[PDB]
Design a protein around this ligand. Structure first.
Ligand SMILES: *[C@@H]1O[C@H](CO)[C@@H](O)[C@H](O)[C@H]1NC(C)=O
Ligand SMILES: *[C@@H]1O[C@H](CO)[C@@H](O)[C@H](O)[C@H]1NC(C)=O
Ligand SMILES: *[C@@H]1O[C@H](CO)[C@@H](O)[C@H](O)[C@H]1NC(C)=O
Ligand SMILES: *[C@@H]1O[C@H](CO)[C@@H](O)[C@H](O)[C@H]1NC(C)=O
Ligand SMILES: *[C@@H]1O[C@H](CO)[C@@H](O)[C@H](O)[C@H]1NC(C)=O
Ligand SMILES: *[C@@H]1O[C@H](CO)[C@@H](O)[C@H](O)[C@H]1NC(C)=O
Lengths: 125, 218, 38, 49
């Protein structure tokens, strides 16, 4: 991105009345002097920020891990969409509304989970 | 006009099931007994003004014959910036985020005279006797819509009762919203402004919250 | 015998031991003392 | 007999007892409630960390 003539298509906001709020987007706009002869620190550098948000909400994006057959009555190590723990899994009558996927106890600890493969609510003890 | 919002504006704050427990939660909720603004659809009266949208808004609609049919959200509403348009037309429900060019008075007829141009479209999806409670919220690029329907037999006021609100859809529109305007078909509709408040919710054994308490009402 | 607030307390390692003298032996002691007094 | 009606009528006469038992629960309650506290970390749950 450092054409010899000067890649002036890239530019930054030089002046602004006040500091902008986080994750906001908007002569106040001045072009970068990107040229191939520019030294280190002055060269063009591309930047990509992965701002993934992970509050307990239906997850949709994550890495390659093979799911396996779910077992009941026998307490095991478990990991549901990154939520790791250990306990027994039992059929639960606690009717999650169609948006709920996890349930938490008084101790801010998980006690009910909705399986990401079968839409069933299971109690963890 | 103004009306006392006796017991409304409450929604499930999170996606966690609880039962027989009192839970405290800080979230953008509608304060109880507030002066919600009242608009009418008579005969004569067809007011559809543009209302500011800050910190989320609670909408209530006492309707018969399905008069209220959508909403628009934006900050300029003149194609200079993006805008989110939600419509429930006679075939289906359509949501669409584009730099729409809007008319001064957008409305539907039983026509679709709501916008005149759609330059840059990014997100798109296509699917008194009644009362509809909605709570709209725009947080960090995600626009959440809570929605509940309830039968009523009342003439010209919001019923005095309690009913929790359940989320239906969350949209990654990511657009700047400052104002909004409801879409009418050619009933009554109340608008209230949400504030950051701490609440106390009473879950019953069935898990449906039955009572709500303010921490700062009095 | 655990097989709710009580269950939530218990699960985190906060267990309750039973008193040695159950209510029956306490009632027997009370009855004995009462009979002696009367 | 007056005692029998009194204990059948009022519930506060046994306050000195309930004040004990309630506290035994209440302290336990807050002893669990501190689990939700983060104490300055980025998350208050161990498995998350
Ligand atoms: C959103 O629009 C309003 C009104 O035009 C403006 O005051 C505000 O700065 C905008 N926010 C961002 C992040 O651009
Ligand atoms: C994923 O799970 C659902 C529900 O069990 C099932 O209907 C679907 O066929 C599954 N898809 C794949 C690719 O396994
Ligand atoms: C609501 O209306 C009453 C009566 O006119 C007025 O006294 C009060 O200040 C209003 N409150 C709000 C929040 O607008
Ligand atoms: C309703 O809106 C959808 C989406 O734009 C459109 O395809 C459909 O034709 C509309 N129906 C009517 C009756 O206008
Ligand atoms: C709308 O799209 C046109 C064509 O790509 C572009 O020139 C213009 O900058 C866009 N407007 C926006 C993104 O606000
Ligand atoms: C729970 O729902 C059942 C089924 O309608 C009902 O019989 C019962 O009274 C409800 N209990 C509570 C506390 O809401």
């Amino acid at each position: 991105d450092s054409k010899v003539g000067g890649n002036y298509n890239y530019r930054y906001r030089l002046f602004r009345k006040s500091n902008l709020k986080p994750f906001e987007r908007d002569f106040p706009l001045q072009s970068y002097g990107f040229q191939p002869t520019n030294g280190v620190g002055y060269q063009p550098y591309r930047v990509v920020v992965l701002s993934f948000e992970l509050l307990h909400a239906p997850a949709t994006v994550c890495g390659p891990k093979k799911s396996t057959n779910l077992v009941k009555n026998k307490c095991v190590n478990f990991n549901f969409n990154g939520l790791t723990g250990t306990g027994v899994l039992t059929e639960s009558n606690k009717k999650f509304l169609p948006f709920q996927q996890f349930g938490r106890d008084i101790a801010d600890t998980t006690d009910a989970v909705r399986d990401p493969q079968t839409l069933e609510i299971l109690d963890i003890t | 006009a103004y009306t006392n919002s006796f017991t409304r504006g409450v929604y499930y704050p999170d996606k966690v099931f609880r039962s027989s427990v009192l839970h405290s939660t800080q979230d953008l909720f509608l304060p109880f007994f507030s002066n919600v603004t009242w608009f009418h659809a008579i005969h004569k009266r067809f007011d559809n003004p543009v209302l500011p949208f800050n910190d989320g808004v609670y909408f209530a609609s006492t309707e018969k014959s399905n008069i209220i049919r959508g909403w628009i959200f934006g900050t300029t509403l003149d194609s200079k910036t993006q805008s989110l348009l939600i419509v429930n037309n006679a075939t289906n429900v359509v949501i669409k985020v584009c730099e729409f060019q809007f008319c001064n008075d957008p409305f539907l007829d039983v026509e679709f005279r709501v916008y005149s141009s759609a330059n840059n479209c990014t997100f798109e999806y296509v699917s008194f006797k009644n009362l509809r409670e909605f709570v709209f919220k725009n947080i960090d690029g995600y626009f959440k819509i809570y929605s509940k329907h309830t039968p009523i037999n009342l003439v010209r006021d919001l019923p005095q009762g309690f009913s929790a609100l359940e989320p239906l859809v969350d949209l990654p529109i990511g657009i700047n919203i400052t104002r909004f305007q409801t879409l009418l078909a050619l009933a009554a509709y109340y608008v209230g402004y949400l504030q950051p408040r701490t609440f106390l919710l009473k879950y019953n054994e069935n898990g449906t919250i039955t009572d709500a308490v303010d921490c700062a009402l009095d | 015998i655990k097989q709710d607030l009580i269950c939530a307390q218990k699960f985190n390692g906060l267990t309750v031991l039973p008193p040695l003298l159950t209510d029956e032996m306490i009632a027997q002691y009370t009855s004995a003392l009462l009979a002696g007094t009367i | 007999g007056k005692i029998q009606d009194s204990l059948s009528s009022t519930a506060s006469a046994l306050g000195k007892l309930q004040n004990v038992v309630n506290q035994n629960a209440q302290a336990l309650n807050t002893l669990v409630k501190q689990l939700s506290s983060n104490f300055g970390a980025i998350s208050s749950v161990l498995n998350d960390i």
